[PDB]
Amino acid sequence: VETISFSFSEFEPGNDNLTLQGASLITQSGVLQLTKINQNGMPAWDSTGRTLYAKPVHIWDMTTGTVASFETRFSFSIEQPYTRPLPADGLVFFMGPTKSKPAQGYGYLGIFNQSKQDNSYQTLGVEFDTFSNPWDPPQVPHIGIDVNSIRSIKTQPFQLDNGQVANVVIKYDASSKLLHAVLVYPSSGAIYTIAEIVDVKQVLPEWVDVGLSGATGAQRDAAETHDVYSWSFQASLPE
Amino acid sequence: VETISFSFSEFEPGNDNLTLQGASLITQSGVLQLTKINQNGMPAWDSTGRTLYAKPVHIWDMTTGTVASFETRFSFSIEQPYTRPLPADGLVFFMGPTKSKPAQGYGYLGIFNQSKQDNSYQTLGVEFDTFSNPWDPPQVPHIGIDVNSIRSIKTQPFQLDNGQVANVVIKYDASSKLLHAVLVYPSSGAIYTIAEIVDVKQVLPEWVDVGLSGATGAQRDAAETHDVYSWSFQASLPE
Ligand SMILES: OC[C@H]1O[C@@H](O[C@H]2[C@H](O)[C@@H](O)[C@H](O)O[C@@H]2CO)[C@H](O)[C@@H](O)[C@H]1O
Ligand SMILES: OC[C@H]1O[C@@H](O[C@H]2[C@H](O)[C@@H](O)[C@H](O)O[C@@H]2CO)[C@H](O)[C@@H](O)[C@H]1O
Ligand SMILES: [Ca+2]
Ligand SMILES: [Ca+2]
Ligand SMILES: [Mn+2]
Ligand SMILES: [Mn+2]
Known part of the structure; x- marks a missing residue:
């Protein structure tokens, strides 16, 4: 049974277990700021940042056909400081091909390049979307389950409690x-719940990188923070 | 689309929308005590109590084959006052045949008569089991999904925070x-989650009564409280 596990109760500047990409940064206070905050303390628009765990995880094995069960837990807060323009764009917990770089920002959230459902993406994501794009339901914010597309297969509206910490639990039973x-x-x-059937063998490669990505908007001040406070993950392949 | 909905933010003594059975009682303070509390304020052993909503709900229609999606939310607390004997037995949210009466108490929780998996029960339940019976996993307390049997098809251990209020959300996507x-x-x-596939058409009758049931143990002082503070439910049949 090969297992992989990690828990960051706080983030340490300079630790080598996390690959920071784009605007992502760990502050001296221990929080992971996925998107940029300016000198005057306000969130910058046109920013994309991601953090990937530095070891790939074995999610399924083609030789035996077994697939892993996993669970991740993280805490984050989003603060939206201006009434107009509408805040944007959101953050995502994702799994995809190893050694990936940031894709398009804004509504694609740093993990897709357009809004097609393309099997070559090989990406599974659980988004917390704050801006309604042409492919979104009208209600924002919403939790969405993304399978090879930014066009979620299932959506659940939720009300943002501005600047408060939200606790997330995502579990997959193989x-x-x-x-x-x-x-x-x-x-x-407030408690919100979403569930859908996803056969990971049809979506993901056998080895994946797991991460968090956040993005702010395409026009001046369409922005908000995407701060993460802790993140843990555990996966077990019955092998 | 026929919908049925109800929300009790507190319980009113004498309201006629709830059928109280066994030891079940609503206090003047608005709380529903599913099992008996003695004059000296301690939980009584050998007690079984249930509360059913007074209108049946149309859960699936045989003529069109449609089945309803539903969600229920409730808050409860369990206080276990003695170290020995072990506290018992737990409470369950259940759906089954209309106009039912209490079945066996103790580990059967007021809804089953033995530990066989019998299709004639036509009962679906989500239990919060506090005593490990021969059919249980060794860890208690545990959340369990019961489909025509007290022998859960899926179990999730949880730690009791003695006498604190727990909030529950159960949702079924047809x-x-x-x-x-x-x-x-x-x-x-603390957040605990459990999910399993259940095709209600294979389990339930078309019309069901929805309720909560609680039970204390079979030997002196194997007991605990099973107090409910609020309960809401909503179901929608695309018909
Ligand atoms: O406003 C945030 C929102 O912008 C969308 O992009 C717009 C852009 O804001 C607008 O100035 C330009 O004329 O057209 C774009 C087409 O929609 C982003 O796509 C969306 O994700 C948000 O970032
Ligand atoms: O102790 C609570 C526990 O009792 C089980 O029943 C026991 C009973 O306590 C014991 O005194 C008697 O000799 O045998 C019974 C067989 O197990 C209940 O079955 C269980 O649900 C709890 O209520
Ligand atoms: Ca969006
Ligand atoms: Ca039991
Ligand atoms: Mn979306
Ligand atoms: Mn049990």
Whole structure:
């Protein structure tokens, strides 16, 4: 059974277990800022940042056909400081091909290049989308399950509690092929849930890099923060 | 589309929208005590109590083959006051045949009569089991999904935060046939999740009564409270 596990209760500047890409940065206070915050302390527009765990994870084995069960938990906050233009774009927890670089930002969230459903993406993502693009449902923010496309196969609207910490739990049970995610805001006590069937063998490569990506908007000040406070992950391949 | 919905932010003594059975009682303070609390304020052993919503709900239609999607949310607390004997037995959210009466108590939780998997039960339940019976996993307490048997098809251990309020969300998406449940303890911030595939058409009658049932143990003082503070439910049949 090969297992891989990690827990960052806080982020350490300079640690070598995380690959930071784009605007991503760890502050001296221990928080991971996925998108840029300016000198005056406000979120910068046109920013994309990602953080990938530095070891690939063996998610399924073609020789035996077994696939791993996994769980990830993370805490984040989004602060939207201006009434207009509308804030944008959101953050995503994703799994895809190893050694990837950032793709398009804005509504593609640093992981897709257009809005087609293309099997060559080989990407699974759980988004927290704050801007309604032509491919989105009208309600934002929303949690969405993305399978080889920014056009989610399932969406769940949620209300943002501005600048408050949200706790996320995403679990995948390989036997039932069920991906279930929960978002809880301790401040208001709000609980949101989403679940869909996803057979990972049809989507992902055998080895994947796991990460978080965030992006701000395409026009001046269409921005918000995408701060992450802790992140843990565990995966077990019955092999 | 026929919908049925209800929300009790608190329980009103004497309201006629709830059928109370066994030891079940609503206090003047608005809480639903599923099992008996003695004069000295401690939970009584050998007690079984249930509360059913007074209108049946149309869960699936044989003529069109459509099945309803539903969601229920409730808050409860369990207080276990003695170190020995082990506390028992737990509470369950259930759906089954209309006009039912309490079945066996103790580990059967007021809804089964033995530990066989019998299709004539026609019962779906999500339990919060506090005592490990011969049919249980060794870890208690645990959340379990029961389909025509007290022998759960899926189990998830959780740690009890004694006497604290737990918030539960159970959702069923008819399209994917996914039953997903979440338990959150606001006090510790603990989040537990369980999900399994359940095709309701193979289990339930077309019309069901929905309820909550609780039971205490078979020997002196193997007991705990099973207090419910609020309960809401909504179901929609695309018909
Ligand atoms: O406004 C944030 C939002 O912008 C979209 O891009 C717009 C851009 O803002 C606008 O100035 C330009 O004329 O056309 C673009 C076409 O939509 C992004 O696509 C969206 O993701 C957000 O970033
Ligand atoms: O102790 C609570 C526990 O009791 C089980 O029943 C026991 C009973 O306690 C014991 O005194 C008797 O000799 O045998 C019974 C067989 O197990 C219940 O089955 C269980 O659900 C709890 O209620
Ligand atoms: Ca979007
Ligand atoms: Ca039991
Ligand atoms: Mn979206
Ligand atoms: Mn059990």
